[PDB]
Amino acid sequence: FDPPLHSTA
Amino acid sequence: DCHLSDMLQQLHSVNASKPSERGLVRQEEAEDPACIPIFWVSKWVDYSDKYGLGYQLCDNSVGVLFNDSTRLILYNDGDSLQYIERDGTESYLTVSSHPNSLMKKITLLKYFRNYMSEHLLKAGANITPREGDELARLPYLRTWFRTRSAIILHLSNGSVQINFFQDHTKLILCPLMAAVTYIDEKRDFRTYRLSLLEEYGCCKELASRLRYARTMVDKLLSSR
């Protein structure tokens, strides 16, 4: 489960 | 898109007044913390190349808009479920009830939820939301899109949220209050009545984000 984009990690 | 028309008119109106193009600017006089949103998106995950978009709302509920335009929603008790199909058909159940038709999608929701929990920061954690109604529905993500500068998140309660990638600033627009909540780069939040910004003006940085907000709302209405 490695999403390309996301909110501020 | 009845709420979006109101938001467009509201944004068109404030931008036309040129709030930052004035000598006397007093944006504090436009503050109305009685208008803080009940709900905003505190975390999001764009995995739409494979599965869809997962998000967290400020109340700790989670949702995922899958690529097939179905929606799964986990309420903040971490157990209660709302499933919304494309045509609008909704189902209320639980994770623990173990419905076989939905296990593929439930498993995915848990992956999204886990990724957000251990990896991502909660936006507006320093904000207390407005109370709301015990009878009102949990809002869900109606639609969304990314530009090169921002993500745009449109909720079913009519609120539109814009998060800017470059400097972490965020906008929450509510057409029901005709209000905007601004989270700056220092994580400070202020809620403004839009009509009061036309009269009192605001700083250059808020005004340019209100200009950008309008373009995005145009995009939302124009995608229908």
Numbering used by the authors:
A (entry chain E): 71 to 79
B (entry chain A): 371 to 594
What does the paper behind this entry write?
We examined the crystal-packing interactions formed by the polo-box domain (PBD) of polo-like kinase 1 (Plk1), a validated anti-cancer target, whose phosphorylation-dependent protein–protein interactions are crucial for successful progression of the cell through mitosis. We have observed an unreported binding site in a number of crystal structures of the PBD, which is formed by the rearrangement of surface residues involved in crystal packing. The new binding site consists of seven residues: Val415, Leu478, and Phe482 form the bottom of the pocket whilst Tyr417, Tyr421, Tyr481, and Tyr485 form the sides of the pocket.
PBIP1 is involved in the localization of Plk1 to the kinetochores and its phosphorylation-dependent interaction with the PBD involving pThr78PBIP1 has been characterized. Only the PBIP1-derived peptide showed significant difference in thermal shifts for the wild-type (14.4 °C) and mutant protein (10.1 °C), so we decided to concentrate our efforts on this. The thermal shifts of 9.7 °C observed for 72-DPPLHSpTA-79 (lacking Phe71), and 10.5 °C observed for 71-ADPPLHSpTA-79 were significantly lower than the one observed for 71-FDPPLHSpTA-79 and showed no significant difference between the wild-type and mutant protein. Our thermal stability studies were further supported by isothermal titration calorimetry (ITC) measurements, which showed an increased affinity for the Phe71-bearing peptide. However, in the structure of the 71-FDPPLHSpTA-79–PBD complex, Phe71PBIP1 is found in the hydrophobic pocket. Linker residues Asp72PBIP1 and Glu7term also adopt similar solvent-exposed conformations, but only the side chain of Asp72PBIP1 is ordered; the backbone nitrogen atom of this residue forms a hydrogen bond with the hydroxy group of Tyr417PBD.
